[PDB]
Amino acid sequence: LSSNFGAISSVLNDILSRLCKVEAEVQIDRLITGRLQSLQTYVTQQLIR
Amino acid sequence: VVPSGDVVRFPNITNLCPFGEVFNATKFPSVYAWERKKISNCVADYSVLYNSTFFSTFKCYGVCATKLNDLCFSNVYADSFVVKGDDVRQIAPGQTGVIADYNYKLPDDFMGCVLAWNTRNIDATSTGNYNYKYRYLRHGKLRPFERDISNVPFSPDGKPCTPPALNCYWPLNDYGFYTTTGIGYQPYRVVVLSFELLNAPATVCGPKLSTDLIKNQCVNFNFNGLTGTGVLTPSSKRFQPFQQFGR
Amino acid sequence: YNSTFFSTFKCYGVCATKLNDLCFSNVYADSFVVKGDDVRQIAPGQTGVI
Amino acid sequence: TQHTSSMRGVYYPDEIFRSDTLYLTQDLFLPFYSNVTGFHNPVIPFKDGIYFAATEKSNVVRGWVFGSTMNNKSQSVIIINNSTNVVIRACNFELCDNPFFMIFDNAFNCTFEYISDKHLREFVFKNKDGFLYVYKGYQPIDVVRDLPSGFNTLKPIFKLPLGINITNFRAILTAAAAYFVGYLKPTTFMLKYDENGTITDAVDCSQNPLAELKCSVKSFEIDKGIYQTSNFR
Ligand SMILES: C=CC1=C(C)/C(=C/c2[nH]c(/C=C3N=C(/C=C4\NC(=O)C(C)=C4C=C)C(C)=C\3CCC(=O)O)c(CCC(=O)O)c2C)NC1=O
Ligand SMILES: *[C@@H]1O[C@H](CO)[C@@H](O[C@@H]2O[C@H](CO)[C@@H](O)[C@H](O)[C@H]2NC(C)=O)[C@H](O)[C@H]1NC(C)=O
Ligand SMILES: CCCCC/C=C/C/C=C/CCCCCCCC(=O)O
Ligand SMILES: CCCCC/C=C/C/C=C/CCCCCCCC(=O)O
Ligand SMILES: *[C@@H]1O[C@H](CO)[C@@H](O)[C@H](O)[C@H]1NC(C)=O
Ligand SMILES: *[C@@H]1O[C@H](CO)[C@@H](O)[C@H](O)[C@H]1NC(C)=O
Ligand SMILES: *[C@@H]1O[C@H](CO)[C@@H](O)[C@H](O)[C@H]1NC(C)=O
Ligand SMILES: *[C@@H]1O[C@H](CO)[C@@H](O)[C@H](O)[C@H]1NC(C)=O
Ligand SMILES: *[C@@H]1O[C@H](CO)[C@@H](O)[C@H](O)[C@H]1NC(C)=O
Ligand SMILES: *[C@@H]1O[C@H](CO)[C@@H](O)[C@H](O)[C@H]1NC(C)=O
Ligand SMILES: *[C@@H]1O[C@H](CO)[C@@H](O)[C@H](O)[C@H]1NC(C)=O
């Protein structure tokens, strides 16, 4: 959860404190995609085990 | 559950930032010898500038302009100089030109704001104001936030020379400022504000009102611009001195 | 740097600071004259008379 | 003569209060078991930042001068400590041939002023982005004629907002003690942070294959067997 995935920061509340909506959604979507694919990796490994 | 509450905590700072001292000075330096001043321990209201000073250029990198009132900055430096009208577009990251190469360079990862305004009534005379200079010859470019105020004679060979010679030039040129020229040949005063966010205790901050603490309830807190949502409990953890928050 | 000063200078596809270590292949120069308010129409994705 | 800097010159490259953690980075650091040059005054070059160590008892060394050409044609910064106070001054000094503990003839055209109110001193000087970072640490050494083995972290004392090149520097002596200089190189280190926010252990990933294995596994304890490592060589 501490990876920023190419965004400006890994903390979700610091991107919303110094950015505007159009420019904040672009940064938030990278974190959303990274965490979604991390959780997908976890569930696939669990299925095989 | 949906949160019902709000907590705002800010440092106890009452002074106003020296807007008049920085923006309204007697005279500004040249661009090749730009001046840096540290700013601390004040409140950046900037609402007093609405009836006095009007900026042709105001652009902010790394933050939003509408978020500057609820935010709380850590270390602020102000860089002041004077350029002409057509050089104001060179005060930006990733730019080239005489000013961006030999006089003033910005980092690519720049957080701050650039604000410039026109001053023809005070910095321009009828006979000519040949007081502001800029460097147009130099062996190589400049690193960011560095200056070179030397005035040695220049020669393309790379060796010292006495400037009554043939291939020797004085590296500085004078801005010729009149009151009867175009808009691209009029004096402009530029101030670059450089700040960093969320490292240290914040000393210059914003004009927001504080609020009493609420304990043991899911409320939206705001500690020096660090917004969030959670429940607040007393602590027994010990911190290093001058360290604000931990993760 | 001591003769010509450009009101407008903007580069697409490259960075302006990378133009000294770069080596180009086929260069064409297109020259014309417009008025002051048409200079913003010389850009991709623009509309207007020009 | 030449000595060896054994596990010396580790500083804080950042500022966040951090509990129990390990962090891998590449940065300008001092390589482990690398050469240092000892002096028991030449114009020593300042390439990318330096580590300066002073073994002294009577405090015969007094600050430094950093500059480009050591003339009055360029800015130079002087950081000295006289009997009462420590002063930092960035001006166009007439740099004399041999300074004493009066260093400059005149001073003109200048901006930055700052006045502030056997044993070993260690300093790290790093000039970047128009700022000069100075880190300092202290050591209660016994009698020796070499830089001792050990590991001590360096506290960041102060950064100066002065925008000049620094290609040369020169120490300033009073006219028993020795000083050693080492150069910083871009290397890969891994650091461990304890439960108080301090650095307690570090390793250089380019020194030994065992250290490269530690950097690849990202731990200090490894078990019996065979592993595959990355390229930190
Ligand atoms: C000019 C650079 C320089 C810097 C940046 C510096 C930092 C520095 N050294 C200190 C201790 C101190 N440091 C010194 C002396 C020295 N320290 C040296 O690096 C050298 C070469 C001498 C020799 C003159 C002294 C006399 C004290 C006061 C405590 C003591 O007696 O050691 C202190 C006060 C620490 C405290 O009171 O808690 C600071 C801020 N000292 C310096 O001299
Ligand atoms: C800081 O000073 C050094 C030395 O004065 C500068 O290095 C010179 O760079 C030019 C550029 O081509 C060379 O022709 C000189 O030979 C260099 N000098 C030496 C002694 O090697 C350096 O450029 C200065 N810093 C900046 C940012 O300009
Ligand atoms: C006409 C020959 C064309 C050669 C091919 C072009 C290569 C790239 C160079 C373009 C010239 C840019 C000049 C503007 C920058 C300096 C002027 C300034 O901003 O101060
Ligand atoms: C007033 C009626 C509004 C109708 C709804 C709008 C539709 C989109 C059209 C907008 C008009 C753009 C005019 C500017 C472009 C031509 C002028 C120029 O650049 O040379
Ligand atoms: C703003 O400036 C004008 C300039 O004349 C002045 O008259 C006015 O009083 C100022 N506003 C306030 C609130 O002082
Ligand atoms: C640049 O142009 C000015 C215009 O007068 C000229 O005087 C100067 O010599 C030129 N620079 C060089 C290096 O020739
Ligand atoms: C310093 O490095 C050289 C290699 O350039 C090496 O030969 C020498 O032994 C080193 N010095 C010491 C004291 O080991
Ligand atoms: C700089 O030093 C030279 C001698 O090296 C001297 O002649 C000159 O006057 C000095 N400059 C100033 C401004 O004093
Ligand atoms: C040390 O130098 C500063 C620099 O001007 C001076 O103000 C101070 O009096 C000096 N102290 C002593 C003891 O010489
Ligand atoms: C430097 O000093 C000279 C005289 O010694 C003066 O003419 C010049 O304006 C000064 N420049 C700056 C940037 O102070
Ligand atoms: C460091 O942290 C531990 C555990 O939180 C604590 O017991 C100790 O007092 C702290 N300080 C020091 C100096 O060890």
CSV table of N, CA, C and O in Angstrom, one decimal, chain B residues 95-141:
chain,number,residue,atom,x,y,z
B,95,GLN,N,12.3,25.6,-20.4
B,95,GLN,CA,12.4,26.7,-21.4
B,95,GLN,C,13.8,27.0,-21.8
B,95,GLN,O,14.8,26.6,-21.1
B,96,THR,N,13.9,27.6,-23.0
B,96,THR,CA,15.2,28.0,-23.5
B,96,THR,C,15.2,29.4,-24.0
B,96,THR,O,14.1,30.0,-24.1
B,97,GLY,N,16.3,30.0,-24.2
B,97,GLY,CA,16.4,31.4,-24.5
B,97,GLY,C,17.6,32.0,-23.8
B,97,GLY,O,18.4,31.3,-23.1
B,98,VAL,N,17.8,33.3,-23.9
B,98,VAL,CA,19.0,33.9,-23.2
B,98,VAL,C,18.8,33.9,-21.7
B,98,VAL,O,19.7,33.6,-20.9
B,99,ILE,N,17.6,34.2,-21.2
B,99,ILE,CA,17.3,34.3,-19.8
B,99,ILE,C,17.4,32.9,-19.2
B,99,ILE,O,17.9,32.7,-18.1
B,100,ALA,N,16.8,31.9,-19.8
B,100,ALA,CA,16.7,30.6,-19.3
B,100,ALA,C,18.1,29.9,-19.4
B,100,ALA,O,18.3,28.9,-18.6
B,101,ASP,N,19.0,30.3,-20.2
B,101,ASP,CA,20.3,29.7,-20.3
B,101,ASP,C,21.4,30.4,-19.4
B,101,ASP,O,22.1,29.7,-18.7
B,102,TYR,N,21.5,31.7,-19.5
B,102,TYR,CA,22.6,32.4,-18.9
B,102,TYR,C,22.3,33.2,-17.6
B,102,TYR,O,23.2,33.7,-17.0
B,103,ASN,N,21.0,33.4,-17.3
B,103,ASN,CA,20.7,34.3,-16.2
B,103,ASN,C,19.9,33.6,-15.1
B,103,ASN,O,20.3,33.7,-14.0
B,104,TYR,N,18.8,32.9,-15.4
B,104,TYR,CA,17.9,32.4,-14.4
B,104,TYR,C,17.3,31.1,-14.9
B,104,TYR,O,16.7,31.0,-15.9
B,105,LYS,N,17.5,30.0,-14.1
B,105,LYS,CA,17.1,28.7,-14.5
B,105,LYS,C,16.2,28.1,-13.4
B,105,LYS,O,16.5,28.2,-12.2
B,106,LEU,N,15.1,27.5,-13.8
B,106,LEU,CA,14.2,26.8,-12.9
B,106,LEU,C,14.4,25.3,-13.0
B,106,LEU,O,14.7,24.7,-14.0
B,107,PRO,N,14.2,24.6,-11.9
B,107,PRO,CA,14.2,23.1,-11.9
B,107,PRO,C,13.0,22.5,-12.6
B,107,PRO,O,12.0,23.2,-12.7
B,108,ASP,N,13.2,21.3,-13.2
B,108,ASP,CA,12.1,20.7,-13.9
B,108,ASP,C,11.0,20.2,-12.9
B,108,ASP,O,9.9,20.3,-13.2
B,109,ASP,N,11.4,19.8,-11.7
B,109,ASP,CA,10.5,19.4,-10.6
B,109,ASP,C,10.3,20.6,-9.7
B,109,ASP,O,10.6,20.6,-8.5
B,110,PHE,N,9.6,21.6,-10.2
B,110,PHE,CA,9.5,22.9,-9.5
B,110,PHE,C,8.1,23.0,-8.8
B,110,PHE,O,7.1,22.8,-9.5
B,111,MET,N,8.1,23.2,-7.5
B,111,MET,CA,6.8,23.5,-6.8
B,111,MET,C,6.9,25.0,-6.4
B,111,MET,O,7.8,25.4,-5.7
B,112,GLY,N,5.9,25.8,-6.8
B,112,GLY,CA,5.9,27.2,-6.4
B,112,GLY,C,5.0,27.9,-7.3
B,112,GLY,O,4.1,27.3,-8.0
B,113,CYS,N,5.2,29.2,-7.4
B,113,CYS,CA,4.4,30.1,-8.2
B,113,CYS,C,5.3,31.2,-8.9
B,113,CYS,O,6.3,31.5,-8.3
B,114,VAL,N,4.9,31.6,-10.0
B,114,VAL,CA,5.6,32.7,-10.7
B,114,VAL,C,4.6,33.8,-11.0
B,114,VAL,O,3.5,33.6,-11.5
B,115,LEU,N,4.9,35.0,-10.6
B,115,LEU,CA,4.0,36.2,-10.7
B,115,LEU,C,4.8,37.4,-11.2
B,115,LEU,O,5.8,37.8,-10.5
B,116,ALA,N,4.3,38.0,-12.2
B,116,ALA,CA,5.0,39.1,-12.9
B,116,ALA,C,4.0,40.2,-13.3
B,116,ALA,O,2.9,39.9,-13.7
B,117,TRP,N,4.4,41.5,-13.1
B,117,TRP,CA,3.5,42.6,-13.5
B,117,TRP,C,4.3,43.7,-14.1
B,117,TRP,O,5.5,43.8,-14.0
B,118,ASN,N,3.6,44.5,-14.9
B,118,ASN,CA,4.2,45.6,-15.7
B,118,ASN,C,4.4,46.8,-14.9
B,118,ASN,O,3.5,47.3,-14.2
B,119,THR,N,5.6,47.4,-15.0
B,119,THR,CA,6.0,48.6,-14.4
B,119,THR,C,6.7,49.6,-15.4
B,119,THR,O,7.9,49.6,-15.5
B,120,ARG,N,5.9,50.3,-16.1
B,120,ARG,CA,6.4,51.3,-17.0
B,120,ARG,C,6.4,52.7,-16.4
B,120,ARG,O,7.2,53.6,-16.9
B,121,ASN,N,5.6,53.0,-15.4
B,121,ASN,CA,5.5,54.3,-14.9
B,121,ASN,C,6.8,54.6,-14.0
B,121,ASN,O,7.2,55.8,-13.9
B,122,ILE,N,7.4,53.6,-13.4
B,122,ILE,CA,8.4,53.8,-12.5
B,122,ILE,C,9.8,53.3,-13.0
B,122,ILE,O,10.8,53.9,-12.7
B,123,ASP,N,9.8,52.3,-13.8
B,123,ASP,CA,11.1,51.7,-14.3
B,123,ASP,C,11.5,52.2,-15.7
B,123,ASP,O,12.5,51.7,-16.2
B,124,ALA,N,10.7,53.1,-16.3
B,124,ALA,CA,11.0,53.6,-17.6
B,124,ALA,C,11.1,55.1,-17.6
B,124,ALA,O,10.2,55.7,-16.9
B,125,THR,N,12.0,55.7,-18.3
B,125,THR,CA,12.2,57.1,-18.4
B,125,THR,C,12.1,57.5,-19.8
B,125,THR,O,12.2,56.7,-20.8
B,126,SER,N,11.9,58.9,-20.0
B,126,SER,CA,11.8,59.4,-21.4
B,126,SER,C,13.1,59.4,-22.1
B,126,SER,O,13.1,59.2,-23.4
B,127,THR,N,14.2,59.5,-21.4
B,127,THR,CA,15.5,59.6,-22.1
B,127,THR,C,16.2,58.2,-22.2
B,127,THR,O,17.1,58.0,-23.0
B,128,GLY,N,15.7,57.2,-21.4
B,128,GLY,CA,16.2,55.9,-21.5
B,128,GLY,C,16.8,55.4,-20.1
B,128,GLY,O,17.5,56.2,-19.4
B,129,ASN,N,16.4,54.2,-19.7
B,129,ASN,CA,16.8,53.7,-18.4
B,129,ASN,C,17.7,52.5,-18.7
B,129,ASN,O,17.4,51.4,-18.8
B,130,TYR,N,19.0,52.9,-18.8
B,130,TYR,CA,20.1,51.9,-19.0
B,130,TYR,C,20.7,51.4,-17.7
B,130,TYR,O,22.0,51.5,-17.6
B,131,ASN,N,19.9,50.9,-16.8
B,131,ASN,CA,20.4,50.5,-15.5
B,131,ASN,C,20.3,49.0,-15.4
B,131,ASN,O,21.1,48.4,-14.6
B,132,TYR,N,19.4,48.3,-16.1
B,132,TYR,CA,19.2,46.9,-15.9
B,132,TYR,C,19.9,46.2,-17.1
B,132,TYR,O,19.8,46.5,-18.2
B,133,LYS,N,20.8,45.2,-16.7
B,133,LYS,CA,21.6,44.4,-17.7
B,133,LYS,C,21.2,43.0,-17.6
B,133,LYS,O,20.5,42.5,-16.7
B,134,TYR,N,21.7,42.2,-18.6
B,134,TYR,CA,21.6,40.8,-18.7
B,134,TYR,C,22.8,40.2,-19.4
B,134,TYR,O,23.4,40.9,-20.2
B,135,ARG,N,23.1,39.0,-19.1
B,135,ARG,CA,24.3,38.3,-19.7
B,135,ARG,C,23.9,37.6,-20.9
B,135,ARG,O,22.9,36.8,-20.9
B,136,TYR,N,24.6,37.7,-22.0
B,136,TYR,CA,24.3,37.1,-23.3
B,136,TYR,C,25.4,36.2,-23.8
B,136,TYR,O,25.3,35.7,-24.9
B,137,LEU,N,26.5,36.1,-23.1
B,137,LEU,CA,27.7,35.3,-23.5
B,137,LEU,C,28.2,34.5,-22.3
B,137,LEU,O,28.5,35.2,-21.3
B,138,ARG,N,28.3,33.2,-22.4
B,138,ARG,CA,28.8,32.4,-21.3
B,138,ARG,C,29.2,31.0,-21.9
B,138,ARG,O,28.6,30.5,-22.8
B,139,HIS,N,30.3,30.5,-21.3
B,139,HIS,CA,30.7,29.1,-21.6
B,139,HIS,C,29.9,28.1,-20.9
B,139,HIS,O,30.2,27.7,-19.8
B,140,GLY,N,28.8,27.7,-21.6
B,140,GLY,CA,27.9,26.7,-21.0
B,140,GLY,C,26.7,27.2,-20.4
B,140,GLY,O,26.5,28.4,-20.2
B,141,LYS,N,25.8,26.3,-20.0
B,141,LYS,CA,24.5,26.7,-19.4
B,141,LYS,C,24.7,26.8,-17.9
B,141,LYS,O,25.8,26.8,-17.4
